Amino acid sequence: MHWSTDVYHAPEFTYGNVHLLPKTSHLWILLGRPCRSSLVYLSIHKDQD
Amino acid sequence: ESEEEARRKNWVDRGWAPWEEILSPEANFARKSLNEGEEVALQSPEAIEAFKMLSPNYRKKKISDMGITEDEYYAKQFEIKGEIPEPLSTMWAGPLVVRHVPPRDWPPRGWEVDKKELEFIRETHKLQSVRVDYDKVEEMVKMETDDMGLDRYKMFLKQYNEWVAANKDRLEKESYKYDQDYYPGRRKRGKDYQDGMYELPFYYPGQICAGKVTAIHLYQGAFVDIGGVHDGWVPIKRNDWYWIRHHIKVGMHVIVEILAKRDPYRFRFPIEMRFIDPNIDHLIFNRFDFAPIFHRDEDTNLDELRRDCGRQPLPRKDPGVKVEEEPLLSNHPYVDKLWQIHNAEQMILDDMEANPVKYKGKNLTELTDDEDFDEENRIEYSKAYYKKALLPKMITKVSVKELDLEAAFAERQHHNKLRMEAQERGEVYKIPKLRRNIEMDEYDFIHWRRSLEEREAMLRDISCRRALGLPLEEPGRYVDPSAFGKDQYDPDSPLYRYDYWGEPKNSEKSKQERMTDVHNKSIVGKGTVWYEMAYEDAVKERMQ
Amino acid sequence: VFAYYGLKTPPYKLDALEPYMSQKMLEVHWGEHHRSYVEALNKQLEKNDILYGCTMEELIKVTYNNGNPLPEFSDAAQVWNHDFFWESMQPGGGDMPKLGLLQQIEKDFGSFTNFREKFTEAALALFGSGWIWLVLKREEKRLAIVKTSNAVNPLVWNDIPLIGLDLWEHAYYLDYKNDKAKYVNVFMNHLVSWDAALGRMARAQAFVNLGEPKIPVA
Amino acid sequence: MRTEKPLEELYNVRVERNVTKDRLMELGVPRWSMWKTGKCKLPWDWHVDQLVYIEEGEVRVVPEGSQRFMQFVAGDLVRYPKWFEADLYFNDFYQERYSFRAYGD
Amino acid sequence: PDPLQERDNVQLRIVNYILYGNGKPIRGISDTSIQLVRTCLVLNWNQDKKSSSCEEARASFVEIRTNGLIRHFLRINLVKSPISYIGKRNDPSGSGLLSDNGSDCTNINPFSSIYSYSKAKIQQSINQPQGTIHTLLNRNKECQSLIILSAANCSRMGPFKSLGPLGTSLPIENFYSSYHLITHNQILVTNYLQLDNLKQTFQVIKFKYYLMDENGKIFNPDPCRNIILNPFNLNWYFLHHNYCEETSKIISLGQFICENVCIAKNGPPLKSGQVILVQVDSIVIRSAKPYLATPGATVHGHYGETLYEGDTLVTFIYE
Amino acid sequence: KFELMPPPYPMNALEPHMSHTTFEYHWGKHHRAYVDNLNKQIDGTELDGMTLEDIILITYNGDLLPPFNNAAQAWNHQFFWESMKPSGGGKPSGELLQLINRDFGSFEAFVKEFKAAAATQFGSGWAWLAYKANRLNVGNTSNPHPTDEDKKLVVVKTPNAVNPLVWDYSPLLTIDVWEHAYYLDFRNRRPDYISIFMEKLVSWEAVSSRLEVAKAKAAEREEEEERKKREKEE
Amino acid sequence: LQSPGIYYRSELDHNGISVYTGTIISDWGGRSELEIDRKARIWARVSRKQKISILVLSSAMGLNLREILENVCYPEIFLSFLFFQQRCELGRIGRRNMNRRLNLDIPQNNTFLLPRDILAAADHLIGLKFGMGALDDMNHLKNKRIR
Ligand SMILES: [Fe+3]
């Protein structure tokens, strides 16, 4: 996800993922392939590999 | 929390940045029109302007009202808003005094040169320890040339020229073979390769070099061309390019300092450098912990990759046992291999004694039992054996080529002749031990002595390391006691298993019934056991 | 054949610290103890050419081998260590830090007096030979006081060192026979170099950023 | 890859080939322990150093999870490092002279 | 009998119990005599104090086939529930039970020709996603996730329309001076350096190049001007890094470009994405898709979370 | 509690080789400090009066406990003084020679080894000569085929403040390679100090005395083991 | 007929926020609900009374209070908040449905209602109360089983 402006940085709830919008804005989805790596995989698989 | 605090948190951890987000007119109108309401008259000035800008003729008239060319409006569309930083200045600390020194790692692995020339080249490393007073440098300036002494450096150059002419084609072939597509950081090949480019061995950490910026990546960083076959890389992460992009532009001549040189096969960017002339050390907050590597198809073992790159070991589960508080090892690997051939020799001797007709006519020194023995087919496993119960079975094809029947024949012919006369004497003869058993015991003894020596050395090693402050276990392997987690736990208390609820101690399956059945059939009676002792205790009582 | 083959004479003269460290003592530590180390490092680098073509900061880490040091780790560490030490002391004396280093000490250790107390405590608590260091941790971005073993230096944990003291006895036996606390106090009062520490922190700021970003209002 | 990175230095296994007997008696090779084995497979995890002076045969050491091995001829002095996990594959008669050493000589 | 006994976990015990119950005599057959006392042997593995452990043993028989003969030998192995061993010296690898498992290609003998043929039989592995591993800074606190950026997510905009090592700094005698850092930073100079250059007058010269030979003599054609000696040719050449030219690009880094923006009449910036790479003749754009949200809506998620396919992004409350 | 015990030799001119000053600082100041420190801390503890040798073992606990260091250094410091007699040096005579000859080849073999080991110690340390009469406490410690010649004399280098007592070997001879000992005298020429010690100062008889004490210790242990065997049999 | 599992039906409430009630169906047909008022008010409908003391029910299951407050996510509202015949006997399909709806990795062999199941149910309910959740439809064929 990505938003430039016109989105409240502080969430409405303390333990939630909900973010209200003060004004109209565009929400972007930067395409990518998600993966689920365990603690063993993160020892060698690092950034920009 | 507060909006400011939230934005701060985001910038620090997530990486938010208010990018430009160039929009179309149709969209600009959508963003500046939905703020008022629906089917309502547009009262805001910017909304009316965006509504009027939906016509091409209106835009082509407004661009002429302000007197701008057709390309000027398109250039102004991609304009950076917000506060722009001040132009940075270059404040040089003092005189730069340098000296051309050949690299310490000049001769690559596998290139042999004359020893005396390499000695005279490496002699220059001793002279680098002397200090120079920078202030008095101006005083000793000599404008006359043709008096500088650079024989050593020259010698290096001579060697270099030879090595490039020797290995250029091989390096280009390897680059074409292992690397498929070109990327900033790989070897310049094809039309991009001009004769006269300094190859990778020429460079060494600590050299200041001048170059131009040829590429800018948001996630990786800047790429500077230092006049060589391999480009240079300055690590700049994703979020810093909001402020660094105003000071670093493609095509800018910059001065850089090489701080590390790596292998181009494993590492993506072999030369990583820092900026000297456009000093931006106050705008880099996100940094790389480890250099990028290639996860190729040839490397199948992750441990070899970790040891080649230099990263931490693969973490494993933390064992609760101690290396010192555990029993020794008294089982030699040759025990099974000697036991099987000993039993085979005994059985063959017994079979030859039972049927002397087959043993007769053939010399006992050499007996060709089977001529179709194969070492590859020595291990044969067949799970069809269901004589007593359904269980797997294995077959071992022992070879008579190495069976030492010479001494075994004499031993058996000496033991039977005495056991028969002992039986005739009214006594029962129980053979205490054989030679093969003695050899197996000696193997067990030497293995036990090896383990004892190992632990005797470990008891001193632990002490000294503890005293001098050295790690007893390899750092990076047993660091996580149970961070790896959420595994189903057999234990009830973790809640991964059931605990009595309203007294629910009942357990599914786990039938003890099947086990009870084999016990019941043989010995149904629920009698009280009288004698109860281990097999070792039984042997001790028998020998006593 | 030999790299790093140089004693790298200190910035000051051998008699610059005479009122506190006699000119003979310095002569011995630098002339004999240090020189020897270099010679043996050169003799060990002549045999192994792979470890010859490596920088000092990389040679130390590659010879440490993550707990199982190679037979040439101790010597190279010592050479580097000693060099840092000579430069970690300046002629005259050290009264108090300067603009940046004093602020960072006040932020990390609370105050400069508490910093001196903790430094003296860590120096006196060390047993045997070793060194005491004032380092800058990268991932934590703060100053810390770490005590090490005979030859181990903070370069093995990727930490930038700023000030160091030699607690090996060879350093103090001649003028301060067995009053090691005195030697510490002298080194902290009239032998510590804060300009060198400030310059090294300025150099380290190119690798670890000590500050807060400029967050746009958007 | 045209591997210029052998396993003798990737894994810190220092091997001295064709050692002279004067250095052997200087270290104490003849006054060490013994170990004999034919064709076997010994998975072993090291806890201390080990100077192995092979005497009779040949030993091919295979580290954990690896497909490439390192071979030691009968005239080599091998120093196995600490925290080493390997699988020694034996093929024929083998004899050695070992002495486990702690931190320091 | 063995002098050295291993500390095995198998505890074999012999239990002898009376046949019939006390006080009740059963009828005795005339043909077969009754067995007053009997004995039996049981195999029970070690039981942990925390949880009761059972002897999960396996029974198999092995036969020595030599000279056309067979043997009757039964083997029992108390195999533990976890295949993983605490240490490698205590590995169960030294055994073979079943040949059904064939997936263990790694068990191929390196001396056989099959090991050499498997190098070419197993082609280069392409099952991997073949992309740059892009970590998540937002997911650093929680379980760290990974984004694989590949050619399917990035595109390239085609049209869109001396140098070398100087030297190595020598050690400085007056270490007190801050000459070690070659250039100061305009922002951080107020921290490590006193305002001496502000009170005094700084020199008008910026770059001073002094080249020292192996004998220790400083040589430079101009006394303090900018002349650089190139390593390969050893010829004094001016840098001219400024060259009285400025390089700028219309498309900056990080800018989100929508479609139908018409930067050029030839090529449109497709994929509606962000510029991640800027070169001298090309532009790389990472694909993205915008979503228009009305005031009062709610975005489900933080800044840089991973949104799988079919996940709720925005909730609109409409009549 | 534990108090400084004077050196057996006069420690004045007993050795012209070792200065009185060296003795005064090494023993008078350093040894005193270790013992005093031990006394200051051991007070009121469970180990108020336990023999220092036993106290060492208890405080080794892998994790060295707070007083281990002071204790060990004190004990070791006293072994040193015992090791050197006034006029001294020569060759071992008596049974030591036989053991030495079996274990290492000649006196000239042990001498070379001891000298070498001492030189290679890095940092503060001690050098030890010991009898291998140890016995593990985990698993299959007992030896089948127990044989004479399984006990041997070994040279052991130690890091600062660790004595072979912790691993149950038999201390016999020691050199203080920690710098306090030889600097004043030889200004860092450590090999010399080692050499002088092994020529002019080693009273081999003192070590031979301890040698036989140790032999008896071993014997008493296996005699007690025999007693235990009888218990479980009958 | 319906399949055993948790459904998280959002019953409309006249006063305050909508009450989120999660019904756990067993193999026999038992029903155990969990309600949520404006406050935490985590109560069960198994007992005759409206409040069945879900905290006391979780404590009586055999789990430690510290582990109970440490395992569940968002421990702030958990700390602020102050049968085995047919209910625990979940079927083979019930375990699969509960592992699919929730995020547990309990093996398929286990067919008993573990306390971790109730813990995760309460966690998902209190998360749905904040907007992090998704309701279920009982008319969906994936929620029904064909005999
Ligand atoms: Fe020193």
Swiss-Prot record, chain E:
It is found in: Plastid, Chloroplast. It comes from the Eukaryota. Disulfide bonds: none annotated. Belongs to the RNA polymerase beta' chain family. RpoC2 subfamily. DNA-dependent RNA polymerase catalyzes the transcription of DNA into RNA using the four ribonucleoside triphosphates as substrates. In plastids the minimal PEP RNA polymerase catalytic core is composed of four subunits: alpha, beta, beta', and beta''. When a (nuclear-encoded) sigma factor is associated with the core the holoenzyme is formed, which can initiate transcription. This is DNA-directed RNA polymerase subunit beta''. The chain holds residues 799 to 1139 of 1392 of the full protein.
Swiss-Prot record, chain G:
It comes from the Eukaryota. Transmembrane segments: none annotated. It is found in: Plastid, Chloroplast. DNA-dependent RNA polymerase catalyzes the transcription of DNA into RNA using the four ribonucleoside triphosphates as substrates. In plastids the minimal PEP RNA polymerase catalytic core is composed of four subunits: alpha, beta, beta', and beta''. When a (nuclear-encoded) sigma factor is associated with the core the holoenzyme is formed, which can initiate transcription. Belongs to the RNA polymerase beta chain family. This is DNA-directed RNA polymerase subunit beta. The lineage of its organism: Eukaryota, Viridiplantae, Streptophyta, Embryophyta, Tracheophyta. The chain holds residues 127 to 315 of 1070 of the full protein.
